[PDB]
Design a protein around this ligand. Structure first.
Ligand SMILES: C[As](C)(=O)[O-]
Ligand SMILES: C[As](C)(=O)[O-]
Ligand SMILES: [Zn+2]
Ligand SMILES: [Zn+2]
Ligand SMILES: [Zn+2]
Ligand SMILES: [Zn+2]
Lengths: 319, 320
């Protein structure tokens, strides 16, 4: 496919440019932003903060982000569109389900879920006409029966439309292997799938084996190590996983991001200020800090451009 | 004090008339109706079905319903307003939380939840300006820590505004007991509280003990017995609890409803069809079947009017 769905409409592959493949404008819950905007100060304040942040990321070279907020992460695509336009940064929206499905999702069959994901990709999200360009799934180490249904529905929607699938995994339980087995049982190519939060451990055997099968490896939370006052595991250590996979021959399988946001209600109160204090760069942390760090370790310009431009383009191109 | 908030604005107490105090337009989940309207055929189809159902209720004497759908039951107050205007039936909307709070609610403190309930009562729901006139709270048998926070936030919002609290219980587990204990610890008067789904038990000692403390008793799911699930008890057995509480001297404490809905996504697919087959009268079941049954059992008109008109008016009218 020669075009990608964004919250402002379709764009050509070449227009995506430097792309952060796992980000959020807001981390919330379905209906929450509209029912309780003053949780974030106001909707206007949240939008203004997001625009300031996206504009700074753009100044640092970012051209596109993929907002991997699903329905149950409180995705408000109208907000995504507002901020995309004002920051002049492309935003790709997601369908799928994260870890907080309400009853009206949890009690659905695989066939029903498949039709929901297809609606969001092929028709539009809500009444907005904005179409999703990626399918987000989350599991909790040992995949539950419902999460298995979500994975199967995601695979079927991907096979029907060509849009990729991206996952949430938990640290330590090597969640990508369980996810990969289920997705392949549906006939989905690994080249359509990113195993996310893969920078949460240093298990290189796990990462390389997935990469060797053709999975994209989401090293997508690099600055999360900077949130704490003095995290035992540094952001540099997370960033060195990028170099490790390059050195093993898997440059083409790497996707990098911040997994940042501008507001969060899906966590206890006041975490946003801790996050912003630890990583004032926000979404600009990848281009301003991680890229120069890797350059200094001797990774060539061509390799960094391949990771930040070519790999996301190949991933997002409907195939 | 003389006015109740509805989805079309304030009404006077006298305007409420025959009021069904526990009902739903749609039983769903936050965000769901707008993300997947075709689950219900279409939004338009859902709306039209609800308008017909409310017009039928109106023709059977109903003038107001209290839609006790909370945020997490997917309450869409814009839908309520549209259907209210088309059916010419008053609808009182709810704040509070039911049994499916999302993470962004589950992680909130009691102070935060209190602010949310207050905003929905004092400012409006979403950006609609439609204010809630009741606070709904749900618990399961033994109250969980989060449900306790919800109860306390509900009490605090009620005490600040005069708006009443109505509950979901598992009557078979005598759930009203733990609810009452928590609500009273906050200084809430039982006369501001309806212990709901109380018709799901035959334990009259449980019901009368609550009534003796001044709680309103929600005998609010009568036709759910006419459907196959829940229990083997008949709807007449449930309706006889109304007579039982009258005879025990608690007429003033009784509230009656159907707990009906016109669409449902927070259960298995097609359950709405099963429900409609078992209760073709919908929200008209109370006035068309239960009221005549009680008349046949010798309950006088004045008593029935007290239960269906006076008691809801006293309950809903904001009061300190
Ligand atoms: C919304 As997240 C902490 O799973 O990237
Ligand atoms: C929405 As109900 C089944 O608790 O009245
Ligand atoms: Zn995640
Ligand atoms: Zn994320
Ligand atoms: Zn209930
Ligand atoms: Zn109910």
């Amino acid at each position: 496919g020669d075009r990608i769905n964004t919250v402002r409409g379709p764009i050509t592959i070449s227009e995506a440019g430097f792309t952060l493949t796992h980000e959020h404008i807001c981390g919330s819950s379905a209906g929450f932003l509209r029912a309780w905007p003053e949780f974030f100060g106001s909707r206007k304040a949240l939008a203004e903060k997001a625009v300031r942040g996206l504009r700074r990321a753009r100044a640092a070279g970012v051209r596109t982000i993929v907002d991997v907020s699903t329905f149950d992460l409180g995705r408000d695509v109208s907000l995504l569109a507002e901020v995309s336009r004002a920051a002049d940064v492309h935003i790709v929206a997601a369908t799928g389900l994260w870890l907080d499905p309400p009853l009206s999702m949890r009690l659905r069959s695989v066939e029903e879920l498949t039709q929901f994901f297809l609606r969001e990709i092929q028709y539009g999200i809500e009444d907005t006409g904005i179409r999703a360009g990626i399918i987000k799934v989350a599991t909790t180490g040992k995949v539950t029966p419902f999460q298995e249904l979500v994975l199967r529905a995601a695979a079927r929607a991907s096979l029907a439309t060509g849009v990729p699938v991206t996952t949430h995994t938990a640290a330590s339980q090597r969640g990508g292997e369980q996810q990969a087995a289920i997705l392949e049982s549906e006939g989905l190519s690994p080249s359509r799938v990113c195993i996310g939060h893969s920078d949460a451990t240093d298990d290189l055997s796990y990462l390389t084996a997935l990469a060797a099968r053709g999975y994209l490896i989401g090293l997508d939370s690099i600055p999360h190590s900077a949130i704490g006052l003095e995290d035992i595991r540094s952001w540099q250590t997370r960033a060195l996983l990028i170099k490790a996979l390059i050195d093993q021959g898997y440059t083409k399988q790497i996707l990098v991001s911040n997994d940042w946001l501008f507001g969060i209600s899906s966590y206890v109160t006041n975490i946003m200020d801790v996050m912003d204090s630890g990583n004032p760069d926000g979404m600009a942390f990848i281009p301003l800090r991680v890229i120069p760090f890797l350059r200094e370790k001797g990774i060539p310009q061509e390799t960094l451009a391949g990771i930040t431009v070519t790999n996301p383009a190949r991933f997002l191109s409907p195939t």
